[PDB]
């Protein structure tokens, strides 16, 4: 299970910081949408719970 946790952390580090590129540019949200589909919020709440 540590392999996926590090993978989740790796995806978190490369995510856009905040709206300084997300709101202005459209590339930040495009990458954010791609990685959002990889980990839907439905499973994230189940893991933490």
């Amino acid at each position: 299970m540590s392999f996926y946790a590090a993978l989740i952390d790796l995806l978190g580090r490369c995510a856009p910081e905040m709206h300084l590129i997300q709101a202005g540019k459209g590339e930040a949200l495009r990458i954010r949408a791609i990685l959002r589909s990889l980990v839907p919020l439905d499973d994230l709440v189940g893991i933490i719970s």
Partner: protein
């Protein structure tokens, strides 16, 4: 009137319905497998209509020309996924996986 060059953004229109070939924002097949469907768009604008002919074989190189019947790979400008003939459980659908 100008010839094509390898690694160029392309614009393809449907001859009959006069709509622009593009991608969608939805998927099917009930699997996650992020792959937007390929469908015609009402208008050209939307950033999801253009495609790029990227290198696909060692015979040709980036920055070179194209020939008759030259196989290549098409990549959507917005969707990083390639244009693929998704031979899924259906009748060999086409999806941007």
């Amino acid at each position: 009137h100008r010839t094509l060059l390898y690694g160029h953004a392309i614009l393809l229109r449907h001859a009959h319905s006069r709509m622009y070939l593009s991608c969608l924002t939805t998927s099917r097949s009930m699997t996650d497998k992020l792959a937007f469907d390929v469908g015609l768009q009402e208008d050209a604008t939307g950033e999801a209509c253009w495609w790029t002919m990227h290198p696909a074989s060692k015979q040709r190189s980036e920055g070179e020309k194209v020939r008759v019947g030259d196989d290549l790979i098409l990549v959507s400008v917005s969707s990083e996924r390639y244009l693929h003939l998704s031979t899924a459980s259906g009748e060999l659908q086409v999806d941007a996986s």
